[PDB]
Amino acid sequence: PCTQERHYEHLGRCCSRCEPGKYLSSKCTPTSDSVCLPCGPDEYLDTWNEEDKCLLHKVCDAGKALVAVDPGNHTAPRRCACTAGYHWNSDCECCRRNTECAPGFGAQHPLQLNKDTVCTPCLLGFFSDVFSSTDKCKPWTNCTLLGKLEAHQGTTESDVVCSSSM
Amino acid sequence: PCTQERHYEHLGRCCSRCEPGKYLSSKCTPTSDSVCLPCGPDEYLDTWNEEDKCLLHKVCDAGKALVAVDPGNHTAPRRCACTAGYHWNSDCECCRRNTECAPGFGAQHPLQLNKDTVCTPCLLGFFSDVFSSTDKCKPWTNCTLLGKLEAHQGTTESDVVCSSSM
Amino acid sequence: PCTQERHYEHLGRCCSRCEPGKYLSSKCTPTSDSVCLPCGPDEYLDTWNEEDKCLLHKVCDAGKALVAVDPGNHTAPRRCACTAGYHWNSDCECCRRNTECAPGFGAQHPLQLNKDTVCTPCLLGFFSDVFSSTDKCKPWTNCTLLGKLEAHQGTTESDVVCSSSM
Amino acid sequence: AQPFAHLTINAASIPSGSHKVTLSSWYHDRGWAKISNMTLSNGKLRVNQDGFYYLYANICFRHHETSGSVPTDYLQLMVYVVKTSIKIPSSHNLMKGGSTKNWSGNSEFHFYSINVGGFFKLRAGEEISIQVSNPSLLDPDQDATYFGAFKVQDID
Amino acid sequence: AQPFAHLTINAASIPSGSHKVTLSSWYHDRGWAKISNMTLSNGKLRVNQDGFYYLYANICFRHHETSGSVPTDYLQLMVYVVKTSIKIPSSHNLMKGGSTKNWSGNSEFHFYSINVGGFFKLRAGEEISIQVSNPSLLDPDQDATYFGAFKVQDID
Amino acid sequence: AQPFAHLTINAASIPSGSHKVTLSSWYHDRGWAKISNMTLSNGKLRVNQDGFYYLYANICFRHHETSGSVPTDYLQLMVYVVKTSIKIPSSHNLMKGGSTKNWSGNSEFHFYSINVGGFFKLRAGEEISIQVSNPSLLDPDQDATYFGAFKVQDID
Ligand SMILES: [Cl-]
Ligand SMILES: [Cl-]
Ligand SMILES: [Cl-]
Ligand SMILES: [Cl-]
Ligand SMILES: [Cl-]
Ligand SMILES: [Cl-]
Ligand SMILES: [Cl-]
Ligand SMILES: [Cl-]
Ligand SMILES: [Cl-]
Ligand SMILES: [Cl-]
Ligand SMILES: [Cl-]
Ligand SMILES: [Cl-]
Ligand code: NA
Ligand code: NA
Ligand code: NA
């Protein structure tokens, strides 16, 4: 009796699996154990395996707006992400443009790489007057900094109006 | 000598064909006759046959605007038709939008299912002022029903004009 | 020892190639030389060859705006060209619309069949006021032929203006 | 001998018009066109030997502006690979491909190709043939418009 | 016996919606659908005998105006031919096809088909399956939406 | 040993530009890429053993908006499967596929794939190779851009 973790059965024999970084070149015979060989250039296997051949790393195609965040090796897969302004969509298997936040709403920060924009309504004293996937709500102008007075108050969609009166 | 209706020749022998609803499982040998087996679920054969296997019924795909007018069975094919407003076109093998009748022309009734609209010019006392694949020519208004008099007469393209005079 | 021009080696033997118009039906054996047969209808080979089978002539498809300038035979390939106004492009493998010369520029003559328009700026005394792939620069009007006088001189882009003064 | 066919369009006999037709003329000998232990008659490829065949077709459509504007603006470019039998007069679709298109833009040339393929059980006497939607748009090149079959294994 | 499969879409079990799915229902016996020395389970085609197989798929998408307007105007019609293994839970793309489309025009019908094929080394236990982008646009016809495999040679 | 090849695009050596080119770099060993009793040299697949081979190609084109706008608005995406011979310097088209496209709309991504296949008689010494119209639009994925061949039967 033996564990499925590092071993497998074949011809009424308990044989040893191949370590990550190696593939199963030939199965165990009645006279010898498994033969495991290193994965070739740009190939990997990430588990203890009985695998015929190694897996080729995915291409982080810049033409798909992808970039490697982790290169991978003979032991680990390559990790890609969509470049700024886009996020991975598993339906199209492609980098889709981020959702824009309407006026009165701002983009939540910190902005997460490879993830779509989360929109939040502007709080008291802040406004947003644009459609944007990156812009947060900006705070109202302080009229006093312009040497002026507050004539009319702002909304979540528009700024304060400043007046130079006497 | 034997008829081609219910029989066929093979190995210098006159063998019997399979009845509708059944397929030819194995050809006649020198020692036995034909072996015929019933058509499986959703399959049919509509003739006396020497057929290897049964035919699958066509799909009356609603996504193609089709609907079954006759379901079929192991003996008969399924019959589909284009739903209201469309007709079958054997060039595109698809349900095409019905032709519209211009003003001065009306759609002939009764409207035939799965067949394109037939246009007819409006007769005396009737008019059509729209493009429509369903609308017949409508008759002129009778001014007297509106408590009015006929000012100017209608055409095949426009209605009568009623006046409230004294 | 023998030349590669009309001969080839095979089974330690110097064998003769097939003349243009003929293909190599069977290779030379240890007891006989090459067997060469004439190319079938609409087929050709243009060189001294060891070819299995003849090449089919290309179609000068009118639907691609092509036309035969030379029909070809069993010995020569067919030659096609793009009809007037178009030129062959080896990227799309298709007959592309000729480039138009802007105002101030004219199409160089003689216009070459199957070749794109060459544009040249208009010389002194000539003008072009249109976009055209065929039009050369036209010369200025001579006011005297219209019974008039030159009011203002022309450019490379516009004609002279004639005046009827006294 | 193992049966096969690779048939290329007979460029000198493509039907005209815009109605769907059965293509009834193909080359069987010249160029890449070839046939072995199958028979060909007016666009119907007859099977002579029972077996499982792989069937395939490649169809190309093209239009140039020198032919004038493309008629109406409903355009659906289709291929159908169809099976008949000298036995059964009626015919049935084996494979179908194509796309709706809009070739009414202002560029000088338009092109589209369809490919289909599949593995089918065929009896001697059965016939394979090709149907296309817009015959006058067919590309007459041998590398462009063709269909074929080759036997993979016996019935058993 | 030499292994093969030609599987046609189970028209009565095409999933709805617009998210990418694995097709998990195919015919294996009726019509042109057939299977031999391979096993089929919920859209996973299991290889029973080691060898080099030719793999192929044909997928058709269609939409008619009587179903209403086609949702959003990002439309990408895709097929993926995917390999898994009862051994390895994870899956990998073997083949991929399709096109971005604009089916928002004003004609009553829209159609598009994808074909893919290739030659692959397969071990017993490995499973082949199909993924499509827009399941509710799938053509349910047997000549339209299908996939298959057939063995060409042994491993050695 | 029966000859075959399944070759996937060498993602690290796809040529740039918009002129038609012969692809001269493919994988022959890693991933699904494989070759047996055929030889491969700079994108030319040499036949070592006479026979009838099935030839096939799948080519994918793609463009994302982060690469900027797609140059001019004449866009024709094409594949050509071409045969040469160390004997004859000249080359000839065996198979051709593709479509004219308009990728100038305002969506972030555009995609299109071509598939072709056919059955051809090939002699030792003959070479098969691939030509594409817009190299900088090529999809570098192994499931996306590939071509292959496998022998079906001997000449006789
Ligand atoms: Cl990876
Ligand atoms: Cl039916
Ligand atoms: Cl020629
Ligand atoms: Cl014919
Ligand atoms: Cl011929
Ligand atoms: Cl079948
Ligand atoms: Cl299933
Ligand atoms: Cl079934
Ligand atoms: Cl493989
Ligand atoms: Cl290479
Ligand atoms: Cl490699
Ligand atoms: Cl050939
Ligand atoms: Na905002
Ligand atoms: Na009317
Ligand atoms: Na000019």
From Swiss-Prot, chains A, B, C:
Positions with a binding annotation for Na(+): 101-102, 105, 128, 130
Glycosylation sites per record: 73, 142
Coiled coil: none
TNFR-Cys repeats: 2-36, 39-80, 82-119, 122-162
Subcellular location: Cell membrane; Membrane raft
Residues exposed to the Extracellular side: 1-166
Superkingdom as given in the UniProt entry: Eukaryota
Disulfide bonds: 2-14, 15-28, 18-36, 39-54, 60-80, 82-95, 92-94, 101-119, 122-137, 143-162
Chain's role: Receptor for TNFSF11/RANKL/TRANCE/OPGL; essential for RANKL-mediated osteoclastogenesis. Its interaction with EEIG1 promotes osteoclastogenesis via facilitating the transcription of NFATC1 and activation of PLCG2. Involved in the regulation of interactions between T-cells and dendritic cells.
Subunit structure, as described in the record: Binds to the clefts between the subunits of the TNFSF11 ligand trimer to form a heterohexamer. Part of a complex composed of EEIG1, TNFRSF11A/RANK, PLCG2, GAB2, TEC and BTK; complex formation increases in the presence of TNFSF11/RANKL. Interacts with TRAF1, TRAF2, TRAF3, TRAF5 and TRAF6. Interacts (via cytoplasmic domain) with GAB2. Interacts (via cytoplasmic domain); with EEIG1 (via N-terminus); when in the presence of TNFSF11/RANKL.
Name listed for the protein in its UniProt record: Tumor necrosis factor receptor superfamily member 11A
Native source organism of the sequence: Mus musculus
Annotated gene: Tnfrsf11a
From Swiss-Prot, chains D, E, F:
Ranges in the topological domain labelled Extracellular: 1-156
Glycan attachment positions: 37, 102
Signal peptide annotation: none
Domain THD, residue spans: 3-152
Disulfide bridge map: none
Location within or outside the cell: Secreted
Protein name in the entry: Tumor necrosis factor ligand superfamily member 11, soluble form
Originating organism: Mus musculus (Mouse)
The encoding gene: Tnfsf11
